[PDB]
């Protein structure tokens, strides 16, 4: 499923992402935009053999187990195939564990290069949240 800017913002809000650990909803929406273009089925193979899954592009090397990535730590204790659902619950809850480690949202390569240092508040503008 491909979400809409405001539709995603509300969905993330329904699962406690709004201001989670100090990270504004704008940042999360901006991250999803450049990471998967709001597509819950987005899957991208990286040069190191790992794959990023879902609307938040969660890596199979550290966070989820796709059964095809050697040395997978699976810190979110969940199969990567669960991150492709139309319901973003699993993805959102794994993201919560990710931003708690200590790298903040820098863990998201697209976010760090496209969102960081910009007015991410614009991403939730015009939304009926």
């Amino acid at each position, epitope marked *: 499923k491909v979400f809409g800017r405001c539709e995603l913002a509300a969905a993330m809000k329904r699962h406690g992402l709004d201001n989670y650990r100090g990270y504004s909803l704008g940042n999360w929406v901006c991250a999803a935009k450049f990471e998967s273009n709001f597509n819950t089925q987005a899957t*991208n*193979r*990286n*040069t190191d053999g790992s794959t990023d899954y879902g609307i938040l592009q969660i890596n199979s090397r550290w966070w989820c187990n796709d059964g095809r990535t050697p040395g997978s730590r699976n810190l979110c204790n969940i199969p990567c195939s669960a991150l492709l659902s139309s319901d973003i619950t699993a993805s959102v809850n794994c993201a919560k564990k990710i931003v708690s480690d200590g790298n903040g949202m820098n863990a998201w*390569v*697209a976010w760090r290069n496209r969102c960081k240092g910009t007015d991410v508040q614009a991403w939730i503008r015009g939304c009926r949240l």
Partner: nanobody
Amino acid sequence: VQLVESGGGSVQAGESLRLSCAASGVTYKNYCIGWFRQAPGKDREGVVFINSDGGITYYADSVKGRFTISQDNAKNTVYLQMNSLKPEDTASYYCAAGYRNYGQCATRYWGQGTQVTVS
């Protein structure tokens, strides 16, 4: 971002082929662009990439010395020169772009793919 490939074909071992990837919009911060390959029955694997600073990194050790990557700014095109082709090189070749991530390229954009068959 748009990536369009061309140049695929069917050749005999020993010959050479050059693939091209015409790209638009790959000007964002810390981009990396390169080629992936997926042979029948195998997983899609990275081949070679170039980053925004001109650095080139190989991900498939078996292609080192045989495959070369080059970028032609004047034509916003990236090339993959494939020399001494072997039957094992048979595969679908994809142009891909992403973000630099400490030596790796986190891919987020893909071309349509082109087939290269080596007999």
